């Protein structure tokens, strides 16, 4: 596998080059706003799949396993991306360059004002830590490989799959450390910052889980066929 042979800089470069584009909202009431968010998410999903296949080690997996990882992590990946590009906009969420929302606007739909605040708090945290782009793409790749690796499955082929994912995950960790060492952080600071970044993924997981609940009880007015299938994976 080429993924295990890459260097830290090569890992960064590959992840940066694989970054999906920032899409626009084709662009309220208690239906207009919801429609914009779901239509946006559906179009981002298509680009997320291309990005996933360019994440080092992902194509080495079976189609079934690739499906499982994306089904588990798609909302997590959407959220951390949203949080990332909302960094420079305190108290606001940048879903799209033409769709910048404050928390008062998020109240216009069902049960999102809670999720809205959690996303803002995550965004504020990244801003506080001065999260770098090279670090962001590492975290998003970790989410893809990690989030569904414990709901896998015996069948030594499957154990071979899970072991491969862990080696790639260790590689991304090495990359994160490499980035921090390059930034001039001491050994102690490297470990601490690494811990800080990964603990945030626990909150991103939490936001996704709460997000899955609401979107599932909102499924009424239109979700795409793809999005409907992604949602029925968590039920």
């Amino acid at each position: 596998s080429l993924a295990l042979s890459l260097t830290a800089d090569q890992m960064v470069s590959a992840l940066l080059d694989a970054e999906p584009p920032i899409l626009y909202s084709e662009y309220f009431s208690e239906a207009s706003m919801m429609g914009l968010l779901t239509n946006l998410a559906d179009r981002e999903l298509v680009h997320m799949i291309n990005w996933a296949k360019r994440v080092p080690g992902f194509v080495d997996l079976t189609l079934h396993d690739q499906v499982h990882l994306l089904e588990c992590a798609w909302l997590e990946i959407l959220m951390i991306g949203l949080v990332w590009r909302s960094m420079e906009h305190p108290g606001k969420l940048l879903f799209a360059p033409n769709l910048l929302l404050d928390r008062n606007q998020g109240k216009c739909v069902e049960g999102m004002v809670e999720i809205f605040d959690m996303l803002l708090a995550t965004s504020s945290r990244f801003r506080m830590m001065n999260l770098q782009g090279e670090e962001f793409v590492c975290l998003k790749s970790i989410i893809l490989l990690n989030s569904g690796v414990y709901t896998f499955l015996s069948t030594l082929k499957s154990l071979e799959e899970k072991d491969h994912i862990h080696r790639v995950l260790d590689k991304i960790t090495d990359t994160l450390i490499h980035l921090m060492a390059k930034a001039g952080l001491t050994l102690q600071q490297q470990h601490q910052r690494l811990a800080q970044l990964l603990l945030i993924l626990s909150h991103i997981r939490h936001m996704s889980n709460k997000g899955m609940e609401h979107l599932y009880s909102m499924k009424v007015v239109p979700l795409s066929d793809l999005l409907l299938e992604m949602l029925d994976a968590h039920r």
């Binding site: 296949k53 189609l63 690739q66 994306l70 089904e71 793809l226 299938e229």
Partner: peptide
Amino acid sequence: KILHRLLQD
């Protein structure tokens, strides 16, 4: 499923 189709294409 659609995700299957998209991953292949």
